[PDB]
Symmetry: C3
Amino acid sequence: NSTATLCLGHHAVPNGTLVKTITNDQIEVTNATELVQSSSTGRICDSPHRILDGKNCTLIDALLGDPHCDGFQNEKWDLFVERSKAYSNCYPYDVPDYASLRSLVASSGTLEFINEDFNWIGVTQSGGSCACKRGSVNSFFSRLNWLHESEQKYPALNVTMPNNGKFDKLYIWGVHHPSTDREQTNLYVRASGRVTVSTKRSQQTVIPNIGSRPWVRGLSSRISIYWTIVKPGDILLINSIGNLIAPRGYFKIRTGKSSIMRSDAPIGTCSSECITPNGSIPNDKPFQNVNKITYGACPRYVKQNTLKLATGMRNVPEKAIAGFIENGWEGMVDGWYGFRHQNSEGTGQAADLKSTQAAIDQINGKLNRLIEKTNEKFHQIEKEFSEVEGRIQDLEKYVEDTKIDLWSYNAELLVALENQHTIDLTDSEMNKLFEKTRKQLRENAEDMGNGCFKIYHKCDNACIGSIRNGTYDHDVYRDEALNNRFQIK
Amino acid sequence: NSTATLCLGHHAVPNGTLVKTITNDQIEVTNATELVQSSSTGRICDSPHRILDGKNCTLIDALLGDPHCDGFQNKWDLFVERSKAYSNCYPYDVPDYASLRSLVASSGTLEFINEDFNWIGVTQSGGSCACKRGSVNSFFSRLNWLHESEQKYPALNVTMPNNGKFDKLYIWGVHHPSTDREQTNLYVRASGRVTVSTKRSQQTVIPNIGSRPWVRGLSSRISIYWTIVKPGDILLINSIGNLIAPRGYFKIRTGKSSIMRSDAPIGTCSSECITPNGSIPNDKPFQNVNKITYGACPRYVKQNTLKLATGMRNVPEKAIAGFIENGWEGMVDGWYGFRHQNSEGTGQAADLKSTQAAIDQINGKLNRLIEKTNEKFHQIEKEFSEVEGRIQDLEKYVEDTKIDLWSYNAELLVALENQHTIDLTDSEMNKLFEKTRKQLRENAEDMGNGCFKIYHKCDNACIGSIRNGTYDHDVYRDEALNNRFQI
Amino acid sequence: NSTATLCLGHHAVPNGTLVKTITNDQIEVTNATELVQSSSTGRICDSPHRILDGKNCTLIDALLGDPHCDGFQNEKWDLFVERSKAYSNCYPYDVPDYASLRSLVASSGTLEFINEDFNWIGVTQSGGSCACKRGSVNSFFSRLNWLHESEQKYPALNVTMPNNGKFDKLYIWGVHHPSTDREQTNLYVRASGRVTVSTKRSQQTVIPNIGSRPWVRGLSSRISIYWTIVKPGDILLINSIGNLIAPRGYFKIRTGKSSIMRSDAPIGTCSSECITPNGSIPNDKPFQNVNKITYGACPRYVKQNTLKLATGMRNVPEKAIAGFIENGWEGMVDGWYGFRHQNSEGTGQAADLKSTQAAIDQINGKLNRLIEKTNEKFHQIEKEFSEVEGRIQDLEKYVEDTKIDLWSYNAELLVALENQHTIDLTDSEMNKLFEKTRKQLRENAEDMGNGCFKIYHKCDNACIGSIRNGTYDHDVYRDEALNNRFQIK
Ligand SMILES: *[C@@H]1O[C@H](CO)[C@@H](O[C@@H]2O[C@H](CO)[C@@H](O[C@@H]3O[C@H](CO)[C@@H](O)[C@H](O)[C@@H]3O)[C@H](O)[C@H]2NC(C)=O)[C@H](O)[C@H]1NC(C)=O
Ligand SMILES: *[C@@H]1O[C@H](CO)[C@@H](O[C@@H]2O[C@H](CO)[C@@H](O[C@@H]3O[C@H](CO)[C@@H](O)[C@H](O)[C@@H]3O)[C@H](O)[C@H]2NC(C)=O)[C@H](O)[C@H]1NC(C)=O
Ligand SMILES: *[C@@H]1O[C@H](CO)[C@@H](O[C@@H]2O[C@H](CO)[C@@H](O[C@@H]3O[C@H](CO)[C@@H](O)[C@H](O)[C@@H]3O)[C@H](O)[C@H]2NC(C)=O)[C@H](O)[C@H]1NC(C)=O
Ligand SMILES: *[C@@H]1O[C@H](CO)[C@@H](O)[C@H](O)[C@H]1NC(C)=O
Ligand SMILES: *[C@@H]1O[C@H](CO)[C@@H](O)[C@H](O)[C@H]1NC(C)=O
Ligand SMILES: *[C@@H]1O[C@H](CO)[C@@H](O)[C@H](O)[C@H]1NC(C)=O
Ligand SMILES: *[C@@H]1O[C@H](CO)[C@@H](O)[C@H](O)[C@H]1NC(C)=O
Ligand SMILES: *[C@@H]1O[C@H](CO)[C@@H](O)[C@H](O)[C@H]1NC(C)=O
Ligand SMILES: *[C@@H]1O[C@H](CO)[C@@H](O)[C@H](O)[C@H]1NC(C)=O
Ligand SMILES: *[C@@H]1O[C@H](CO)[C@@H](O)[C@H](O)[C@H]1NC(C)=O
Ligand SMILES: *[C@@H]1O[C@H](CO)[C@@H](O)[C@H](O)[C@H]1NC(C)=O
Ligand SMILES: *[C@@H]1O[C@H](CO)[C@@H](O)[C@H](O)[C@H]1NC(C)=O
Ligand SMILES: *[C@@H]1O[C@H](CO)[C@@H](O)[C@H](O)[C@H]1NC(C)=O
Ligand SMILES: *[C@@H]1O[C@H](CO)[C@@H](O)[C@H](O)[C@H]1NC(C)=O
Ligand SMILES: *[C@@H]1O[C@H](CO)[C@@H](O)[C@H](O)[C@H]1NC(C)=O
C-alpha cells in the first residue's frame, strides 16, 4: 500500500535458436544469423566478370584452332568456363605438361593471335587431314602449319623471328609422330626428324617417335604440342630437318586477373562477384560451403555447413511481478530491456530505449566487421583431378586440404568467441540498467534479490516515470522512505 | 556475542600448477591437464587399420615381383616400410619413383590379373643370375623380359583393350644394356624403342647403352614405367627391342590407404592414430610425437607441453576470513563454501551448486577440445633421404607452414581457454557472495574481506537457512536494525 | 559543511589514438603501440649472418667458374645476395631445372671445390673459347673440363671415381650442343655423342642436339649443365662417346641454414637478425609488412600496413568535482587512477600507485608475450618469379598467398582480442578501486552515482589520507555519520 515495486527485466521469445560458445555447444538465444553460405541459384552471372562459355571447346582446342572452335579466335575473358561436353575433332594430339599450358593461357586471358610471315623454303605448307575437316574439306589446326616435303625434298628449315616489340610473344608449335616408316619418309624424306626451337635464353629439341598408336578418329599418328615465350629484344629461332608443325604467328600473352573453371552451370543475366562451379553465390556471409573452387570476391570455403552467429541475448523462458533473475519477459516486444512496476495506481510496463540500442549497436558492430576484409582470388591452383598423377597432385591436394582445415578452425573459433561476447555484452546491459536504477534510488529502496526494488514510499505514475526517464530526485522521498524502512513492525 | 560472522571462500591446494594466459605466462591454478600427447607405446597397433608389414620389402619391390617378396602377391590400409629393406633382383631405377610408390600406396592393393599377351617371334621370361628364385636364374614375377629368338626380334605390336568397368594399372620397363655386343645378342638391332600408348597418352623410351657401376654383378639396368588404361580405352605396346613387358595389370582403386616408413614393431592392440614412432592415443587435441601420422590423430604442434587449467586460481591461505586474497586449503569437499562463527561455535560447509556450476563449465570446455576430428590418410612425404631441390623445398615449406599455424592455434586456444576458466571460477565466487548479500538485506554488513557481519543472534539453524537459501530477513530485521544503528 | 565528497577517477589525455576491437573498429585509447614493422634502413647488416655479396655474379656462374667470378672460389656464406646487375661472360649455357640446382647449392652454403685426378685417355683436355676469356686469352669454366678429339680420335671414355670418404660429393658436369655437323665431327669425330653419368642408385643419359641457336656472345652452340650427388661408399662412373663437359672434381655439399636472396640493397656494417630484399629490419614487433621474402629471425609477414595495440585505457574526455562515470581526468598526470576530494580544508588530488601499477604490469605482460620466437626461417621457397612456368609456379604462389592470408587473419584477430582485454582490465582496475573505497566507508558514506562518495562526517586531510592509504577506521566516525545520514530535513 505505502510502497511500490519496480522490476528490471529483459525480453524473451517463444522461438529461440541454439548457438555455440566455448563452454556450451548448445545455448539458446532469441535470434541468430547464418554465417555459412550453402545455397546457389545454379547459374553463373555474366556480371561483373567477362564470362566466356567454351561450350564444345576446351581452352587448348580453341588455342590450337580446332575447326569447330573457330568462333573463339582472338577472344578475351575474365573466366573461361569449360563444359564437360567438350570434345576434340581435329588431328589427335597430346600436350606434354598440358596443365601448365592450359594454366598460363587461362591466366593470360586472351587468344589474340598475330600472324607472322614465316618463310619456309622448299616445303609444302598447310597440310590437311581427313580427321580435321573444315567446311567438309581436309584441314588442320588454324594456328599451326603442317609442313611436309615438296618435290620429294625437305631441305633443312632454319628460320628466325625476332621480337622487335615491347610485349612478350607466345609461340605454339608442334612435332608430328608418324605411324610407319613409309609415312615418315613420304612426308619428311628423312627417316629421323629433329625439331629445335630456341631463343637466347632457352632451347627445346624434340625427337619424333614412330610407331603404331591406337586409332583416334581414323588416325594412328599423333602431334605433341610445345610452347615458347620470346621476350622483347630476344629472338625466336626454329630449326628442323623434319616433322615440324610450325606456328603461323604468336599469341599476345598478358598478366591479368583471368582464370579458367570447369562447370556445367548455365550462364545467366545477373550480377554476382563470386563464382563457383555450382553457379554464382552471394558474398553477404563471411564463409561458404558451396565449393572450394571459387573466382572473384568470395566468402572463404569451410567444411561446416552451418555456423549460427548469435544476434540477441540468451533466451530465458518466463517463470506478483518479477525481475530478470532467471526470468525473461516474453510480453516485452518493443524493446530488449524495460521496467515493470506496481504502485497504488496499478501496474505498467515500459521499455528502455538507450540500453536496447546499446546492445543492438554492438551486435551490428560485430556484423560489419564479420562481413569485412579481402578474399578476392583469381587464377589459383586446380582442386579437382580426373587422372592419377602422384607427387605433384598429392602436394596440390594437401595444400588445399591444409588450407580448408585452417579456415574451418578460424570460423569455428570466431563464432564461438563472438557468441560468448554477445552473451556477455547483453548480460552487462541488463546489469548496467539495474545498477543505474540502484544509484538513483539511493536509500529510498532495497534490492529484493529477484531483480526488483522495493520502493519504500508512495510512488505514483509520475514518480515511476521519473525513474525510467532518469530524473528521479531521492531527496524528495528520503524522509518518507527512511521512516518506512527503519520502522518497528 | 549478539552478532555472527559469515565468510565466503573458495578451496586451495598445496600442489598447484602453473598455466599461461595472454597477460600472465605463469599463473598458478589448483589443477591442470595436458593437451599435447608426447609419448607413444612404441608399437603399431594392428587395429582398426589393416597393417601390412613390408619386412625386407619395399612396396615397389613387392609390386614388380622381387623373389624374396613373393609373399606379397595380391591389400593394406597402411604399408609399413622397414629401413632394413633391400633389393635382390635385377638392378633398376624408376623415373618418378616417388609418384609410382605414392599411387600404389594410395590404391592399397597389389591384386594382379594375368593377361595373355601373345609375343610373336621372341623368347619370353628371360632370367638373370642377379635375380635368383629357388637358386635358378629368374626375373621380376610381374614383368616379362623379352629377347631374340633364332637370332631374330620381329617388331612387337600387341594390343590389349580394356573391355571392363575398372581401371587397369600396367607396369612395364625398358632394358639398358652395358655394351653394344649385349644389345645385339639380345635384341638383334643396335638400337631399340619401346612405345606404350593409349587413346589419350603416349610414352616412348629410348634405351641407353653404357657401362654403369656393378650392382649385384651386373652393369646393366632397367627403367620402370607405368600406364593406366581406362574402361573403353586400349593399351597398345609397340617395341623394336629392349622391352620389359607386363604379364597383366594391377587393379587400381581409390581408397584411404597409405604408406609409412617406420621400424616400430607391430602390436596386438587397437589405436586410431599411427606415427612412425608407434601408435599414440587421440584423447588430446594436439601431439608432439611425429608430424607423420595416419588415421584419426591429434594435430602436430611444436610445443612439448600445453597445460589447460581445470581448476580455479590457486590462492594460498593467509579470526575467520573470506575469499579476498585468501584460499581455503581446509575445504576438500567443494570448491566454494561458507565459514561462520556464532554463539554456538564455528563451522564450515561447501556449496554444491556453485561447485558443480564451475565443474560443468570446465567439463564443457574439455568436451569441445576433443571433438573436431583430424582423420587423414595418404598425404605428402615429410622426410627425405636425397637432395632434390624445388619440389622438395615446396613440400618442406608447406608442412612447416602448416605446423607453425597449428602451433599458434594451440598456443592461442589454451591461453584463451585458461583466461575464461579463471574468469568463470572467479564469477562463481562473486555470484555466491552476491547471492548471500541479497538474502541478508539490511540484517548484515559487508566487512570487506569476503565476510558478512550479521547483526543478530544467528544460531546453527539460522546459518543453515542462509546456506540452504531459505533465510527470512523479516524475522531478524527489527533485531538487526537495532544492533546496526545503535550508538 | 558537515560532509565531504570523495571522487574516484582515471586519467585522460588530449592526444588519444584509435584502436580496434571485435565490436568497435574505432575506439579511442590514451596510448597505443604499432605491431607491424613497415620501415627498413635500406641496407643489409653484415651481422650476425655471414653475408656474401655476389656483385656481378650469380651463384650458378660462381659455381661453374665464370672467369669474372674467380673471386668466389671456395667461398662460404649464410646468405648469398644476388644483384640484378649480374651477367654471364663465359660459354653460353642453360641448366635443366636451373631453380633446383641454384636452391641446393644455396642451401648447402659453400663452394668448396676439391680437384680430383680424372684420367681421360686419348682426348685433349681444357678446351677454350673466345666467348670465355680469362686474362685476355681463350678459356672456359674453371670447374669444368671441355674435352675434344686428339689426333682426330675420340676413344670411348669410361672413367670411375669412387667415394672412399665419409661425406657426400656434388659433381657438376655438362653436355656440349654443337651448331653444325662439321663442328660435331671436328670436335668429337663421331656424328653423334652420348654422355652417361651413373652411380649405383641413379643414371643420367643425355643426347646432344645439333642445330643453329641464336647468337649469344658470338656463339650458336650451347652447353647443358647437369649434377650428380655421390654418397659415401657409392661410385661415380662417367661414360661418354662425345660432347662430354667433364668435372675437375666435386663440391663439398653440406646441410646448413644457408640460403640465397635477390636484392639490390647495399651491405652495411650493423647487426640485425632479420634480412629482407629491402634491407635488414628490426624484430621488435611481432609482424612486418616490408617483404614476404625474409631470412633469419624475423617478424611474420602480414598484409596490413598498421596494427595498433592499445597500451592505455579508453580515453574519455573530461566534461563541483566529479568521478569516473563518463568523465576522465586530464589533470591527473602522475597516475592512471586517483582520488579527488573536497572537505572543510579545501580540495585535493592524489594518484593511486597500486592500481596504476596493476594496470601497467598487465599491459607490459601482454607486450612481452607477443615477442616469443617461433619464426626463425632460412632456406624457403622462391616467392618472386621472372618467367612464366605454370603448374609448379602456380602452386608456389598459392602456398605463399595462403600462408600470408592466414597470418594476416591471426594478426587481425589477435590485436582485436588484445585491445578488448586491455580495455576490460583497465575498466576493472577502476571498479576495484571504487569497490575497495566502498568497503572502507561502510555506513559512513553513500554512493552518489557519478563515481563519488558523499562522506557524512567531518573528514579532514588526515582522514582523507587514511582512505587513500587504506587505513580508514569506520568505527571512529560511525556514530557521527549515522546521525547525518538518517536525519530528518
Ligand atoms: C599394330 O596393332 C594395332 C592393333 O592391332 C593395329 O591397329 C588397328 O588397325 C586397324 C586398321 O588396320 C584398325 O581397324 C579399323 O577400325 C575401324 C574402327 O574400329 C574400322 O572402321 C576400320 O575399317 C578398321 O577395321 C584398328 O582400330 C586398329 N586398332 C587400334 C587399337 O587402333 C595397327 O594397325 C598395327 N600396326 C602395324 C604397323 O602393324
Ligand atoms: C668401364 O669402367 C668400369 C669401372 O672400372 C668397369 O666396371 C668395372 O668392371 C669390372 C669388370 O671386371 C668390375 O670388376 C668386378 O668387380 C667385382 C666387385 O668387387 C669383383 O668381384 C669381380 O671379380 C670383378 O673384378 C668392377 O667392379 C667394375 N666397376 C664398377 C664401378 O662397376 C667396366 O667394366 C668398364 N667398361 C668398359 C667397356 O671398359
Ligand atoms: C640459321 O639462321 C640464323 C639466323 O639468321 C643464323 O644465325 C645468324 O648467323 C649470322 C652469321 O653467322 C649472324 O651474323 C652475325 O651477327 C653479328 C651481330 O650480332 C654480326 O656482328 C656478325 O658479323 C654476323 O653478322 C647472326 O647474328 C645470326 N643470327 C642469330 C639470330 O643468331 C644461322 O647462321 C643459320 N644457320 C645455318 C646453318 O644456316
Ligand atoms: C521467430 O518468429 C518471428 C515471428 O514470425 C520471426 O520474425 C523471427 O525471425 C523468427 N526467428 C527465428 C530465428 O526463429
Ligand atoms: C535477427 O537477427 C538478424 C541478424 O542480425 C537480423 O538480420 C534481424 O533483423 C534480427 N531480427 C529481429 C527480430 O529484430
Ligand atoms: C556444340 O555441339 C552441338 C552438338 O554437336 C551442336 O549442336 C552445337 O551447334 C555446337 N555449338 C556451337 C556453338 O557450335
Ligand atoms: C556444389 O557443386 C559440387 C559439384 O559441382 C558438389 O560437389 C557440391 O556438393 C555442390 N553443393 C552445393 C550446395 O552447391
Ligand atoms: C595434488 O595432489 C593430489 C593428492 O595426492 C593429487 O590427487 C592431484 O592430482 C595433485 N594435483 C596436482 C595439480 O599436482
Ligand atoms: C629378411 O627376411 C628373411 C626371412 O625371414 C630373413 O631370414 C632375413 O634375415 C631378413 N632380414 C632381416 C630380418 O633383417
Ligand atoms: C620419433 O620420431 C623420430 C624418429 O621416428 C625422432 O625424432 C625420435 O626418435 C622420436 N621423437 C618423438 C618426439 O617421439
Ligand atoms: C583434475 O583435472 C582432471 C581433468 O579435468 C580430472 O580428471 C581430475 O580428477 C582432477 N582432480 C581433482 C582432484 O579435481
Ligand atoms: C601525446 O603527447 C605527449 C606529449 O608530447 C607524447 O609524449 C605522447 O607520446 C603522445 N601520445 C600519443 C598517443 O599521441
Ligand atoms: C663488375 O663489372 C663491371 C663492368 O665490367 C666492373 O666495372 C666492376 O668493377 C665489376 N665489379 C667487381 C666487384 O668486380
Ligand atoms: C619493399 O620492396 C619491394 C620491392 O622493391 C616493394 O614493392 C615494397 O613496396 C617495399 N616496401 C618497403 C616498405 O620498402
Ligand atoms: C605509451 O605506450 C608505450 C608502449 O607501452 C610505452 O612505451 C610508453 O611509455 C607509453 N607512453 C606514456 C606517455 O605512457
